[PDB]
């Protein structure tokens, strides 16, 4: 669904045009009432944002335990071991899988967990180039948190010590508007991205896959940490900005809460 900003392109324009004037004025009243409905909805979305912040403390422990498992810092419990690796399979079918590959003591944690999860999501996979793959192998965790003031959220990408860059955490921050646009209020469909803020990557010599010599910008997942700038910092750039935000939403709303389901590929499109 899109808002038609060219009123003469409105689907029912000719019906509107033919309305007698006294009926038109009733429609005008409804447009005024619609703006008030949208103001109340903006308050609703602010309350939802508060709920998400409140639940961060509850989600945190499950995500922290997941990071510890992925890194090999903690051993699965007996009740964890007895959980089926894939949801559909029964005792007989499972014992097959568990015998298909003997234990390897040289294998610590779950290698390539976040790389696999991210690349199984069709939107994020488009953003992963081949020279990005060995870098994302060092990703030990992906986390997210929201704020009320300033309104928005961040995503943090935690990297083990690696030969590509020195940073241990790459942060992507989105500042969101929760109020309707005063000059176009009727389009309001929820929070909208004001600005995206990336992070400076301290690349080791000759490892910067975001650059190529023709020196130009190369295609790379890590351009996520140079987001497009808003208009107050400069066109087509705002569609770039929306596509960056949509990937941030995918990572925060979908991949982070259900990472292992993307790792196994049990979440499909």
């Amino acid at each position: 669904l899109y808002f038609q900003h060219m009123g003469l392109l409105s689907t029912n324009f000719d019906m509107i045009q033919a309305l007698p004037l006294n009926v038109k004025q009733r429609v005008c009243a409804l447009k005024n009432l619609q703006m008030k409905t949208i103001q109340i909805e903006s308050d609703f979305y602010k309350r939802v944002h508060e709920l998400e912040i409140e639940f961060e403390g509850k989600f945190k422990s499950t995500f922290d335990q997941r990071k510890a498992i992925v890194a090999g810092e903690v051993e699965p419990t007996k009740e964890q071991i007895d959980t089926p690796i894939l949801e559909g399979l029964e005792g007989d079918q499972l014992a097959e899988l568990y015998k298909a590959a003997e234990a390897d003591p040289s294998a610590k944690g779950i290698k390539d967990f976040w790389l696999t999860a991210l690349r199984t999501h069709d939107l994020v996979a488009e953003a992963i180039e081949e020279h990005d793959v060995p870098i994302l192998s060092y990703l030990t965790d992906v986390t997210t948190a929201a704020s009320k003031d300033p309104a928005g959220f961040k995503i943090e990408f935690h990297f083990a010590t690696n030969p590509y860059f020195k940073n241990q955490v790459l942060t992507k921050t989105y500042l969101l508007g929760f109020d309707p646009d005063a000059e176009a209020p009727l389009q309001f469909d929820g929070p909208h991205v004001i600005r995206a803020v990336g992070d400076t990557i301290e690349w080791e010599d000759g490892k910067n896959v975001t650059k190529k010599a023709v020196t130009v910008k190369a295609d790379s997942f890590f351009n996520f940490f140079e987001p497009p700038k808003s208009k107050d910092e400069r066109e087509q750039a705002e569609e770039f900005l929306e596509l960056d935000y949509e990937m941030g939403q995918a990572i925060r709303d979908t991949i982070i809460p259900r990472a292992v389901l993307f790792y196994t590929g049990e979440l499909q499109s």
Binding site: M6, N12, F13, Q17, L123
Partner: protein, 180 residues
């Protein structure tokens, strides 16, 4: 009584990027599209009312188009509908049917209107693709000629009179759109 104004406008920007269209001219364009659609659909039904299941395919639309549109318009429309179907069956974020076919006119909505009027009810996916390309081709031809007439008259906005000059002075468009 359907409106294709947003699609007509997007087609206008393709043939005349810096040209507008008045609201009354847009009503006339919609009448053109609706009249051609109804005629094409009514004959596609009649031609498929005689096979077993009664299933309107890309090929029934093609025959109805050869019957309704005159001479060269028919050949070009059949060309356009054929290319849209081929690109659509060759095609694969989820992309809409219209963009899969490389079209601006709405494939999904035309499928719904076809299925709704019960024109030989049961409609194949290729049929709205083909018909959308035909109506889009006709819209582009009219808009191209009306746009030319507009800025020949030193205007940047297609008015009703620029549409009548485009239609009446073109032999095949005039025969196709005479009754509207």
């Amino acid at each position: 009584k359907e409106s294709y104004s947003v699609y007509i406008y997007r087609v206008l920007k393709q043939v005349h990027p810096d040209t507008g269209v008045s609201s009354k001219a847009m009503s006339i364009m919609n009448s053109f599209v609706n009249d051609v659609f109804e005629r094409i659909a009514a004959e596609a039904s009649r031609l498929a009312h005689y096979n077993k299941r009664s299933t309107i395919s890309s090929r029934e639309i093609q025959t109805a188009v050869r019957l309704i549109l005159p001479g060269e318009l028919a050949k070009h429309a059949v060309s356009e509908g054929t290319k849209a179907v081929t690109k659509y069956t060759s095609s694969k974020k989820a992309k809409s049917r219209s963009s899969r076919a490389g079209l601006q006119f709405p494939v999904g909505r035309l499928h719904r209107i076809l299925r709704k009027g019960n024109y030989a009810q049961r409609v194949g996916a290729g049929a709205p693709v083909y018909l959308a390309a035909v109506l889009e081709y006709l819209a582009a031809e009219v808009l191209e000629l009306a746009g030319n007439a507009a800025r020949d008259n030193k205007k940047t906005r297609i008015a009703p009179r620029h549409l009548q000059l485009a239609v009446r002075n073109d032999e095949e468009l005039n025969k196709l759109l005479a009754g509207v």
